[PDB]
Amino acid sequence: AAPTATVTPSSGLSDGTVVKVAGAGLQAGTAYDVGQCAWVDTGVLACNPADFSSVTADANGSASTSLTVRRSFEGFLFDGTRWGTVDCTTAACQVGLSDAAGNGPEGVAISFN
């Protein structure tokens, strides 16, 4: 299940933009892995280790991190495959954070336009 996190508006924002991400109701004391992934194909989305951050939720089960918005970058498929340079300005991207098990708060649906 995805927790409740408040992220800033990153839809229609070009490089340099900063998208805030605050989790609320997530595993307390649990680690999360945030990153900017762009959908390349059906069920196939690339990830960019250039905008991958990290953070840990406090006892309150709330975390706070900043996600860098990129216009485009190497779409690193979670599977560990090189999809290709994705164009966030061509499709809708989203940020998120994964822990050891690979869990995180309600995915972050974003876009560029």
From Swiss-Prot:
Alphabetic keyword roster: Antibiotic, Antimicrobial, Disulfide bond, DNA-binding, Signal
Bridged cysteine pairs (disulfide): 37-47, 88-93
Keyword Signal: yes
Any one Gene Ontology BP term: defense response to bacterium
GO function terms (MF aspect): DNA binding
Family per record: Belongs to the neocarzinostatin family.
Function: NCS has antibiotic activity (for Gram-positive bacteria) and antitumor activity (for certain mouse tumors). NCS binds non-covalently to a chromophore which is the cytotoxic and mutagenic component of the antibiotic. The chromophore binds to DNA as a weak intercalator and causes single- and double-strand breaks.
Protein's name in the database: Neocarzinostatin
Origin organism lineage: Bacteria, Bacillati, Actinomycetota, Actinomycetes, Kitasatosporales
